[PDB]
Amino acid sequence: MAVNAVHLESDAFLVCMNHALSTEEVMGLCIGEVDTNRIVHIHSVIILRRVEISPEQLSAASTEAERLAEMTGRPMRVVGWYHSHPHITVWPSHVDVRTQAMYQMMDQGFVGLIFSCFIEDKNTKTGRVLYTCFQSVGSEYERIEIPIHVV
Amino acid sequence: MAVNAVHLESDAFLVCMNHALSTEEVMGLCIGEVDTNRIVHIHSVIILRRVEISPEQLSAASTEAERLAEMTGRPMRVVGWYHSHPHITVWPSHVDVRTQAMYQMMDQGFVGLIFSCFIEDKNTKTGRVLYTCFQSVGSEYERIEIPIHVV
Ligand SMILES: [Zn+2]
Ligand SMILES: [Zn+2]
């Protein structure tokens, strides 16, 4: 079992929350660290528009990794990826599962993260936001949920 | 200081050594882990032919990351990149420094690794192989050597 849990610091949570409400095609970059107990600490999340990473994406990631490392004193890095599900259920689409899968070909403890304000019940007057953390598992891959906590 | 030292297990060393002798354009992928003391453990190295990673490169990396994690029990990942300097000095070319620099925009503790059997003295009868570990540091980037040990 690669990752036991994911500790998401409250500020990075609020960022994902704010974009989950956007309700509009982008993807986020989770930045933080991993400790002895296979726990992924996410201190910040940056949201921007085979495996390829644009120089625009690199500079944004590096800038926050600098700001975080300068704050904490510890070295930071990209540990996960975020995107929103405003028009579908919070669960990872089969594309997300196959995407996360090839991400794990590099970090193996890499993490998939999804927020969703979507509600199919069109008669309820009650607000809802879901957030799940997932990975991937011959033959096809499938979702495996990772416990996620907020600090 | 992102990384204190690099612990390179003896078998991964021999691999880099074997290709350093090839004397012939490829690049290697260092696979391992990082611990509390900012030490990069490299358990294996795979050598194959903006930031882009081919699906051919991904499958190779994942396969060894599986084999290592199955052996050690701990989760593995890509921690560095290797290439040989058979026709130049062991020191990182300015391209290597700029390459390593944008690698660090993702991992920050990511490591550059170079082996070299090159000897400019054409009158000496004595064999030599150098290996250095480096990173990158507004304005231009420059080489910063990382201590490297073999297990
Ligand atoms: Zn999706
Ligand atoms: Zn070079």
Numbering used by the authors:
A (entry chain A), B (entry chain A): 1 to 24, 27 to 51, 59 to 146, 151 to 164
Copy text verbatim from the article accompanying this structure deposition:
To understand how KIAA0157 supports the catalytic function of BRCC36, we set out to solve an inactive-state structure of BRCC36 in isolation. Unlike CfBRCC36, which showed a propensity to aggregate at high protein concentrations, DrBRCC36 existed as a concentration dependent monomer-dimer in equilibrium and readily crystallized. Interestingly, DrBRCC36 adopted the analogous homodimer configuration involving the MPN domain (buried SA = 1693 Å2) displayed by the CfBRCC36-KIAA0157ΔC heterodimer (B for stereo view and combined sequence alignment), with the main exception that the CCHB helices α4 and α5 were completely disordered. While the MPN+ domains of DrBRCC36 and CfBRCC36 were highly similar (RMSD of 2.0 Å over 140 Cα atoms), notable differences in the active site region of DrBRCC36 were apparent that might account for its lack of DUB activity in comparison to CfBRCC36 complexed to KIAA0157. In particular, the E-loop of the DrBRCC36 inactive structure was partially disordered and shifted with respect to the CfBRCC36 active structure, giving rise to a 4-5 Å displacement of the catalytic glutamate (Glu30 in CfBRCC36; Glu27 in DrBRCC36). Additionally, a major portion of Ins-1 was disordered and the ordered portion (helix α2) was shifted relative to the corresponding position in CfBRCC36. Both of these structural distortions may be attributable to the loss of supporting interactions afforded by heterodimerization of CfBRCC36 with CfKIAA0157, as follows: Firstly, in the active heterodimer structure, a productive conformation of CfBRCC36 Ins-1 appears supported by direct contacts to CfBRCC36 helix α4, including between the invariant Arg53 (Ins-1) and Asp186 (α4) side chains and between the backbone carbonyl of Arg53 (Ins-1) and the invariant Glu183 (α4) side chain. The absence of the CCHB elements (specifically helix α4) in the inactive structure precluded formation of these interactions.
BRCC36 is the catalytic subunit responsible for the majority of K63-Ub specific DUB activity in the cytoplasm and in the nucleus as part of two distinct macromolecular assemblies characterized by the presence of either of the MPN− pseudo DUB proteins KIAA0157 or Abraxas. The Abraxas complex (ARISC) functions in DNA repair and breast cancer suppression, while the BRCC36 isopeptidase complex (BRISC) promotes interferon dependent responses by deubiquitinating and stabilizing the type I interferon receptor, IFNAR1. BRCC36 consists of a functional metalloprotease JAMM/MPN+ domain followed by a predicted coiled coil region implicated in protein-protein interactions. KIAA0157 and Abraxas are required for the catalytic function of BRCC36 in both complexes, and enable association of two additional shared subunits (BRCC45 and MERIT40) to each holoenzyme.
